[PDB]
Amino acid sequence: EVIPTVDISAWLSSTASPESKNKVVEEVRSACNKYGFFNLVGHGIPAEAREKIFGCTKKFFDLPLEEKMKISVDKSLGKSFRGYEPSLIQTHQDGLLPDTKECFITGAEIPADHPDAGKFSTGPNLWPEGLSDKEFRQPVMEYRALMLDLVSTIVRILGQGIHKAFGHPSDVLNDILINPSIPMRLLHYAPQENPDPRQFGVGDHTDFGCVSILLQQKGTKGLEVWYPPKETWIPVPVIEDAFVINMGDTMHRWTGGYYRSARHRVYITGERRYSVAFFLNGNLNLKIKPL
Template structure:
């Protein structure tokens, strides 16, 4: 089985330059491996958008698969608790996200950003974008710079501080649209500024159940009314993934 990213399940290996998260910019200088829940062939969701088997490298299970899947399970529990807390901050009841959390797409992404060339403009590891899903969790390594968020009023990029044992929690577009901006997704990017050290990160993306309809919770009609989370995802990925 090859490791190249599967366009339906979203799982697998993404080569450097295969995405451009910022429209009109050069391809992102990063490579990645996306890992999800392994969906068995007899599962009703098997073969639907973002549900399928993982693609594993040929190496001992205890060296790669086992620790990655264990980390994913811990992160899924943490993300679920955060979603419950976010529900309490809204006037729609504590169970408002229950269906969305029923069979969630929730992935670990292993990211590598290579060093910069010594001369010339700094290449962007991940172009300016908002995350597609509900929430993203990232534990940053102290002293490793690169993640920046746009300060709208100043129109400038602000480094996100790295604090030991503290997760960055980022709101994605699905949750932002669903709550009509009560929880807002923010524009951010990654620039590995080092010419001597590669940058590594392992974000966890909690994207929810793909069949959940994204009609705004406050009841007004918008362009998103009637679309499922999966349909919104597919539209976004189709613009970010470069055709090869």
């Protein structure tokens, strides 16, 4: 068992044959129904954009810890959960140790005086005073835009797989793109030579939202996915020019389980590891209804 790779070039091309485009819908619906994950290529985002966001991520986490804590998540407006979260505080199971993960959290930018500001994960972002807009904020928000565009493509492909499966309009799912809740996290995993097997980078979880898009770093590993049929954890290989796509619980319930939300985690390694995780959640008003 291996996590598959799906090339969406045809679906984004305006000259590809309808056969080529359907083949993309087949490979996607199928990976999401069997593994809940795939690797995605053919997205059209340049290698520069991926280089630039890891530049931002390293600059940020290289900051002094007192410097990051100045925008610690507990300082964000109300229930906007934005800013810096340090390592060794997130836990998953009582027998185990907290996660080595260090993370920085953004969402869609909303002025402080907006009506929804302060509500759950909606409001303004917190930005580090010690970095210039040009070093950090502008690239981060530009990458967010590229991610929003890609996840909108992914959603419409999923909707088309729903059409083929159960006969619904191929825009069943497109209402989550209306004013979406789209957090992203910049992730840092400090390396360890001899790690305790009771501690992970991130422990066994599912994602709660709809779609997640992950950018891993060339030369690292750690991400693995639980596949019930063989009762095994499958590794997710770092593919060149790829994003890792998985389904969340909201998509699970909202389909019949047809798109699976699969358990996954990141074990600790000796190599320093960065990743950028962007997620698409259900809306703040949208009552998500099954089939």
